[PDB]
Nucleic acid binder design. Structure first.
Lengths: 52, 134, 107, 51, 60
RNA sequence: UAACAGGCAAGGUGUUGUAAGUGGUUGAGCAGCUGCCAUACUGCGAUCCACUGAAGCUUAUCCUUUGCUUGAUGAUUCGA
């Protein structure tokens, strides 16, 4: 986590145009490789994985 | 009253019953928290006051026409650090409050110290009577 | 091989951390053992009495932070045990533990 | 729109954003003083035994 | 934006510490708790050898 | 076999906040000494200053990685 400083953009609250501290979280996200696909049919008992 | 806008939840440093200082020149030398003027309450939870909170007071040291008698009062300083939206944690050297009317009009005429800035935008007549806001 | 001699520096205050004081350390004598059991593989460890005199130097509460030891692997001699190879850990009085890389060579 | 992102050190009470600012505010320590004068000095002092 | 620490002489980015208001009333912005504790303990910032006011009484 | 790890190490980042040694008279003074030559050193002195934001610790559940070093084996069971 690291905490931004930003300036707020919201009409008439009392932090309108006045710069606020927020906390933020950092998420390391390196790319997804798509590696297959699944299909699903409707059944009267749920969803059902048909094909992979 | 005096509220326009929306005050943010600060840390409520003054419960029932704390003895803060009177900074008012009314001759009272104490306040004493009997209640807080918006507290709905929870079981075992004491009502507590922070900056800009109107509360119900008595006077424990002071003039005898002010002692032994319930009065309203607004808190202008506190020792519990409290966050502002600018990320500032700000605290004071003394808890203090001023004896006030029912309609936010200040009773006396001068304030001996600084008034916190979250107090002074709710109560104009405490802003009008202080040297240094914040 | 089967007879090696390493001069290494074990950061003792990392092992014996997470253990309550007055019990740190008779556990250093238990961590010098499970340290010469990993770098040398042999589960037999003979600690020099000078290593004892040094781990017990500042009492049962205060042990060294680093310590420079020599692990000498040798063969059992007196009616050889199930495992032939044992380790002998000796104490090396090093003044400065800085820039002292682990040397595998030792006569 | 962010004005600022605090990248000060979270292993303590960090006082500087970038390691440049730790060398703008503070100076060179018994460190990069000595390590910048143990290279250019030794490059003319390794030959002192040779000559 | 960038306050100065009233004990240690350090720059203060947003976040990072307190602001004690006295009733004189002077505001004191401190860097972190180590400084503010040494202020209320009434250490002198020209005699703790790690602050900027000590580093210009000397050079260091 | 060693594209990987473990131990160290180095650097980062912190945390205490100026190590030990040496030098200075830095220093309140000295029923302490010392020539004619007017002189002076001290193993005398808390403290102070210089080397010195030094030194210590810092993953054990901190961060990084060309550094040094190590790493051929196990055991139990399971069939459409």
């Amino acid at each position: 986590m690291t905490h931004i400083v930003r300036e707020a953009d919201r009409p008439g609250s009392k932090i309108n145009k006045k710069e606020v501290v927020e906390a933020v979280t950092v998420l390391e996200t390196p790319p997804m490789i798509v590696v297959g696909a699944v299909g699903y049919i409707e059944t009267p008992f749920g969803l059902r994985a048909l094909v992979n | 009253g005096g509220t326009a806008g929306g005050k943010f939840r600060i840390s409520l440093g003054l419960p029932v019953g704390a003895v803060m200082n009177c900074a008012d020149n009314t001759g009272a030398k104490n306040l004493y928290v009997i209640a807080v003027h918006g507290i709905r309450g929870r079981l075992n939870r004491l009502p507590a006051a922070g900056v800009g909170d109107m509360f119900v007071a008595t006077v424990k040291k002071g003039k005898p026409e002010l002692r032994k008698k319930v009065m309203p009062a607004v808190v202008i300083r506190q020792r519990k650090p409290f966050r502002r939206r600018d990320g500032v944690f700000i605290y004071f050297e003394d808890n203090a409050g001023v004896i006030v009317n029912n309609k936010g009009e200040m009773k006396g005429s001068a304030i001996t110290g600084p008034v916190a800035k979250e107090c002074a935008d709710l109560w104009p007549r405490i802003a009008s009577n202080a040297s240094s806001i914040a | 091989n089967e007879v090696v001699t390493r001069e290494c520096t074990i950061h003792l205050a990392k092992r014996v951390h997470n253990i309550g004081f007055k019990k740190r350390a008779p556990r250093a004598i238990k961590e010098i053992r499970k340290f010469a059991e990993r770098e040398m593989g042999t589960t037999d460890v003979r600690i020099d009495t000078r290593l004892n005199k040094h781990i017990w130097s500042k009492g049962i509460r205060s042990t060294p932070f680093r310590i420079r030891v020599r692990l000498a692997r040798r063969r059992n001699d007196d009616e050889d045990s199930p495992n032939k190879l044992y380790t002998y850990v000796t104490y090396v009085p090093v003044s400065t533990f800085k820039n002292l890389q682990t040397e595998n060579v030792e006569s | 729109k962010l004005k600022f992102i605090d990248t000060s050190s979270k292993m303590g009470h960090g006082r500087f954003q970038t390691p440049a600012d730790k060398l703008a505010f503070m100076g060179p320590l018994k460190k990069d003083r000595l390590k910048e004068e143990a290279a250019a000095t030794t490059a003319a002092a390794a030959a002192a035994t040779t000559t | 934006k960038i306050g100065l620490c009233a004990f240690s002489g350090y720059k203060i980015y947003p976040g990072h510490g307190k602001t004690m208001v006295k009733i004189d009333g002077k505001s004191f912005t401190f860097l972190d708790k180590k400084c503010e504790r040494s202020y209320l303990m009434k250490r002198n910032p020209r005699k703790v050898t790690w602050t900027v006011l000590y580093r210009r009484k000397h050079r260091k």
